[PDB]
Assembly symmetry: D2
């Protein structure tokens, strides 16, 4: 006999069990590990799987997390370059790639392996350019559109609500405002929805968002766009904020909360867009994924920007093969 | 045609999805609502179902909880006397029945509460055949046996809250004695959740330091530390609280949430809960009492084999003999 | 030597975030359990005049200490047990009856915690918050009435039920007096910043297909309905008080619809307390959000302030 | 006026407000950020301050954390190379300095990190003279002694992260062997956080069941369970992780938040952290190593007296001689 046999008397019979809320993180770079630690911190999964092509670094990150198991509530942390380790995931976060032509080749291999072992999963795409790669993930996986989610402008909106909170001196959760469309240079700041305690700030300042504004809100939007670039210049990358926002998305889905997030969904047929492109809009997230999108009253220039972004994205998307 | 339809544009096709971690609390008395509020506070369920025979109270308790949904993370709270509201529960907490009057043994509640369980235990597994049943109603050890006979479920899915509360009271009294946190005080109250509970002095330790080695008189009448009085306080704790406020509820609610956390998060933590202990320490009958057990998503998968001293084994069999007498005469 | 001296070798107790709950009825214990569940304090004190029930409640909470992160739970009818509290939650009571209760409780609170923040929960909460402010001598930023905080939570729940989303994703403010005369600020009701009144301009009027005036009446009637069904309400208010305490003890500056002294706002000339969007942090209630309310909403605020002052003007000492 | 003045009407006068549970992290490398993200994720502080000599990276880490403020409960995140930004800290975590190269002993870093601490520690105490210092930089036991001598703080306010991490690793490996949660496993690694650490086999247990009483060969060479191998894996764990990913950070960040939680919440939980152990187990000089210690809002208030076997005392005193041998040659 062994010490396990002499100390522990089995009551329930032996079993190989399938986890209930397994999460897989593809890519253990700065972003992937930031997602992993935030996911573990919120006690969101009973099995965290890591996957990467760098076998040594992957094993090291896995061991480092396992050594903290005493302080967590995740009884199984696993990792391998073989995608069988991701089997039966509920949510798969894809952060792999360089930081379009190069990332599409990565996704052409990764996405089929994901749905081969987790056909019922939800896929959150984080790799840049995220709106284009969410389209690639949707096409390659064959999954319905409510199960392919691009992180999109969820982070851009968090940055905007932080800068707005700094102007007013209240908590970012008490400041409301949505950055929508394309994650990056061409995002759209819906000024009509910017409010505090239901007080529409554009009604107190109708020049909000224009070039003659005593409060300079166009500069705030510019700082949201330039935030990634400035932080990248200072520390080489960004990871902590995106990791926190991904865990926020996973919380809404795994707990089935039906909270509204500015994430990227397939917006063909909305606001006059005719191509299959992914853009960020207010979306309802729950245990089934992205089940609903909020219909908004967007001004002409806001719709014009969405149409322009959709044209720019599709112009890249149409030349991709297989 | 509806504000929902004007504002909410569908992306996924309309369906009805089963809950992932639904929990039912049967009986919304003092204990049932303390379990419910602790479960909700820890964000342990995506659907909470309540059942009671008092329709008006049951509805008001559902509504009160729903009014706090802004501060919670449970998107569905439902309640009805019909057990169809409990369908597809992962865990069913049973707190219905009568409680102790002032100075009344939990063993005096057997017959009244067995009759309650014969009505409700069949209706539970009818609508939740895949569920785990946590017995809270007293006497918990006997009612866990009764639940294990009436539902047909395997042993690993029928769990009595048992001495998880009793050990929590013991570790608190330990903690006050030594000046450290109760989580840093280790000790196990086992056997009956009642007057015949057994303090396992051989395992009472701080940071791996056996306190019985420091004081061999631990638990005897020639003890300068009077550890026997600490065990008496644990036994007397419920009677003292009932005399002061009429009942107990907050501590047991926290204890039940603690068990549910280990199972729904699949942690495999060890809790002293009441299980079928036949063939252990000389127990010859299907006696239910508390032993250190491993809880996870499957329920009660394992029991920890202990190396008890002779005085402790005798107290355990003495506790089991007390429990077997009432069990064997149950219709 | 003792076992504590044999086992514990010394190397080296003022609480950092002490909270007192006054009154251990249904509401007080609901506040206590929600405060403990969120690990908001290192020392919880309870005070009531029913000595035996107070002791039993204290012992019951202590027995669950293993599952909590609050190392000191104390209780006593004597207010010395409340010494040096950061926040005091007042839930005691059964107007004339409750004023005689507060004339006793409030001076004892400030005697033993002269720098505390007081949260008044007892009804009528707007009158009793004013009474607390006068008796305590505290600046108005340290006297907070729970006010319409719970009402706005009930409103957002009913919105969420109407739309199928989480209440935290529904936004709308119930302000003014906590009773039947609360104001629904329809112009702020929004989902994802989409103004629901601009989609339904008849929001709040009599001829409204979405019947928003009825949702406002359900907010008022729900308190009466729960009371008729289970005898009282407690779980929702306990969660809402714990949410307020979280904003202050974590210094978050989140906005809550709590009751503050609104003299000089919206034409109100008397010293009355009404619910407005207020910024709560470690200093207490440091700011109020300036809104541009409609005429009838301001008219209801001035009517409530008149009814409140009509009762307040005849209170002695 | 500005938008802030037209929208927000002051109820309270403006005031200089001192933070309530401010934490500073010195050194924003792999370990410092892992601590920060763990501190922020558990909502342990209302003000996080960051300090480093790399001004650009320091500001980038500050902005990156600030961009996640919507998902946090920390209203103030600040960063500067000037220690005035650390003022009024309750706890200061020092993770600055050089780390092990592949295959390098922690003790080989002592002279480089002592010179780093000679400038860091005085600046910390100038701006937070009433703080607790958690030393993380290696060799942590010696640098805790150095910190204690440079700070002038009482012993109960200078803490080395110590074997809190080695013990978590040991309890994890024990858990994988037994199939239960590490929190239900109990075992202590004491002494130096390094090659000469001591595994207290006499205190290893599960539910109070002494595992050395089930296997008296535990820790020796003729052991069927190969427990000496488990301790070897703990000692070698850092070198193996460094070989694979170049460093370690996630587990120590979780360990540091664990200590901070016990202290800021005043819990008096027991952790194996590095403290001044002169006069214990025959140790003659002011050396720091890990023993079970009670941590609360005052810091390290108490040490647990253990009944160590003669072999365990010898290994512990051997570890103290090794540390003191390096401690003598400091200037
Ligand atoms: N959505 C957002 O807002 C947001 C914010 C930050 C970063 N990002 C994006 O996330 C991505 C991750 O950035 P990072 O800082 O973690 O970079 P990183 O270099 O630290 O991580 C890249 C990882 O991808 C892995 N990888 C490379 N090729 C692979 C393949 N064929 N299969 C599997 N794995 C492979 C590498 O092993 C590496 O671990 C970047 O593309 C970045 O642009 C997005
Ligand atoms: N395990 C423990 O450590 C522990 C601690 C405290 C109490 N308890 C036990 O928990 C039980 C609950 O006590 P309480 O304080 O809530 O008493 P209570 O009277 O407040 O609650 C009893 C509730 O059960 C309901 N009920 C009765 N028969 C029912 C039936 N057939 N179906 C559905 N509901 C029914 C009643 O309507 C009532 O609401 C008692 O038996 C008590 O002894 C156990
Ligand atoms: N503002 C809100 O949203 C809201 C919601 C519910 C209830 N309430 C109010 O909260 C109060 C509490 O209601 P409850 O259901 O707990 O009532 P309850 O009868 O259950 O509790 C009242 C408690 O106050 C205590 N008490 C009486 N006089 C006292 C004194 N001088 N000092 C200390 N304690 C004293 C009593 O001992 C009793 O325990 C009620 O007055 C109710 O109107 C407010
Ligand atoms: N105690 C443990 O269990 C444990 C576990 C892991 C690492 N460590 C130790 O923690 C330390 C940090 O490791 P790391 O991987 O974060 O290193 P790193 O190289 O990633 O970061 C070190 C940081 O310290 C900063 N720094 C250096 N000198 C400084 C000074 N004089 N003032 C201010 N900042 C200064 C550097 O700019 C750098 O950002 C190492 O010494 C390592 O050995 C200890």
């Amino acid at each position: 006999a062994t010490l396990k046999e002499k100390l522990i008397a089995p009551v329930a019979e032996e079993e190989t069990t399938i986890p209930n809320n397994k999460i897989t993180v593809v890519g253990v770079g700065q972003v992937g590990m930031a997602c992993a630690i935030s996911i573990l911190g919120k006690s969101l999964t009973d099995e965290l799987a890591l996957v990467d092509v760098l076998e040594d670094k992957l094993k090291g990150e896995m061991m480092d997390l396992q050594h903290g198991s005493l302080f967590l509530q995740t009884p199984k942390i696993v990792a391998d370059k073989d995608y069988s380790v991701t089997a039966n995931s509920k949510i798969v976060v894809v952060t792999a790639g360089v930081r379009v032509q190069r990332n599409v080749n990565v996704f052409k291999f990764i996405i089929p392996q994901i749905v081969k072992y987790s056909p019922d999963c939800i896929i959150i795409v984080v790799s840049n350019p995220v709106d284009i790669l969410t389209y690639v993930t949707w096409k390659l996986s064959g999954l319905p559109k409510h199960r392919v989610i691009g992180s999109g402008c969820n982070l851009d909106s968090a940055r905007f609500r932080y800068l707005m909170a700094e102007k007013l001196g209240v908590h970012p959760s008490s400041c409301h405002g949505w950055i929508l469309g394309e994650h990056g240079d061409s995002s759209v700041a819906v000024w009509s929805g910017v409010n505090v305690a239901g007080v529409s700030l554009q009604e107190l300042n109708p020049e909000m968002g224009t070039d003659n504004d005593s409060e300079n809100w166009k500069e705030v939007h510019k700082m949201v766009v330039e935030s990634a670039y400035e932080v990248i210049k200072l520390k080489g990358y960004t990871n902590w904020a995106i990791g926190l926002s991904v865990a926020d998305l996973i919380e809404s889905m795994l707990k089935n909360l039906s909270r509204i997030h500015p994430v990227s969904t397939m917006v063909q047929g909305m606001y006059g867009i005719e191509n299959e492109v992914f853009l960020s809009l207010p979306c309802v997230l729950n245990a089934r994924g992205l089940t609903s999108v909020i219909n908004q009253k967007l001004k002409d220039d806001e719709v014009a920007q969405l149409k322009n972004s959709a044209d720019t994205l599709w112009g890249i998307q149409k030349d991709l093969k297989d």
